[PDB]
């Protein structure tokens, strides 16, 4: 179904989470097809987006546009607070989020949970220039469930939690108890940033996500969005919430983001787009503002 | 262009976005003409309502057109005081006209659409938006806007909106002479807003439009972008250019404005905050 039976080497991203639409990509090579204990895993060499990671038929990243997601999900929370030291990432992807967290020189510890070792192994083999992400000596990789890991975490441990999840299908990561777990694992005024889907496609799912966060997190609660051409509807959003404690202002950065530089310039994130990301269209704005 | 990758699905293929296509499941085909100018399809889509297509390229869908039509219209029109005379190049489905008509200081809306079939299709298959054409201030010309514009009285217009297709004879709308034509027909400090493609797919083309624009318009020259799921890459952008004359600040609207679904003063400003890869190139 996802691979065209009509004309060779077209992949089409079909889902009932985005009914009646597919982003089709010309595929040169499948580099990897694989079935873990959790999910179907495909990597292809696309004609125009470089390498593409697909889990359960859903595009997770392309080399060409991953920067828009990976820089926004990392820098929106981490540039909003001073001197973040301890960070938790839920979901490993290709390591590109870890690479973004590691630009922040105040960070000392990056704990990351990925349930599926196949996803880690696939990152290291097929996406090695971004999967160096995993090798930063600050990084502590747990192959295990992130929901359990967070129940089990010491209270008040983290400056920041980044929830780099797939779609709510994964469904527990969008619910009140998981958020209560996050609230408890954050230091007072610690921040969470989560994958919060498409304003065009899932207004109903997002209204509930913001209601749960408004209830659990007593600091700040904001919603941001970014252009990601190879996500469905060409955009995805983020919950930014702070726990009870010091003032947090997600709307502007505190901080802009070594002799030997390990990173290229930011490709997408900057201090102006940080603010712009919180200016929603009128159809979305009405709802999310309460 | 129909069932080219999936049976029952429209796929938007073009060497303007190599290696990719947006695919929409088609409930039914509503129209199929071949005017003296382009191949015209309207189809009823599964989930984006009615869809207009010219030469295999998506012009609009009922579900997301608000994001294009409200931004190409209100970014220019909310950046100046009491616009009275307005020229639109391109008719689409009358959506842009409907949005221009929200501005109560506007007296005259000249619009050029070379292809009459586009207009007839709009009124027939998109009637609730095609009302844009019916408003008493609208002066509809079935003719070449390039020609209409070179034939205009110098300094006549407060604003021109270029709601063009892709730079594919449409390519004239992207070149110095047409830009000189506009700079001329605008009053001093008058503004133009142009369809200016995707920062993800067309940085080269955009760079050339900006540079061209910066030679001609001696007021402000700015680029803005917006989410449109059914345009290639999911975003489209706009040149905003003011002619020599009173200062225009496109990032800070001077005024506020069947309700608006997308545009608002906050998104007005955010529309000029480009990603770092675009922001460097587009600035100097």
Residue numbers in the entry:
A (entry chain B): 42 to 210, 213 to 300, 305 to 337
B (entry chain A): 43 to 210, 212 to 300, 311 to 337
Text of the article:
The structures of apo AtSPDS1 and AtSPDS2 present the PEG molecules (absorbed from the crystallization solution) bound within the active site. The conformation of this linear ligand mimics PUT, providing the information about the substrate binding mode inside the catalytic pocket. Additional β strand (Ser46-Ile48) is formed only in chain H of AtSPDS2 (one of the eight chains in the asymmetric unit) creating three-stranded β-sheet at the N-terminus. One subunit of the AtSPDS2 (chain H) presents the state, where no ligand is bound in the active site in neither the cofactor binding compartment nor in the polyamine groove. The conformation of this chain stands out from the others and presents the possible open conformation of the active site. Comparison of the chain H of AtSPDS2 in the open conformation with chain A of the AtSPDS1-CHA complex shows that the AtSPDS adopts two significantly different conformations. In the open conformation, the biggest conformational difference concerns the region with η6. The preceding loop uncoils and η6 is now moved toward α8, over 10 Å away from the position in the closed form. Therefore, the negatively charged active site is uncovered and ready to incorporate cofactor and substrate.
Longer polyamines are produced by aminopropyltransferases (APTs), enzymes that catalyze the transfer of an aminopropyl group from decarboxylated S-adenosylmethionine (dc-SAM), a universal cofactor of APTs, to a polyamine substrate. Thus, spermidine synthase (SPDS) utilizes PUT as the substrate for spermidine (SPD) biosynthesis. AtSPDS1 and AtSPDS2 share the fold of polyamine biosynthesis proteins with the characteristic two-domain topology. The active site of AtSPDS is formed between the N-terminal and C-terminal domains.
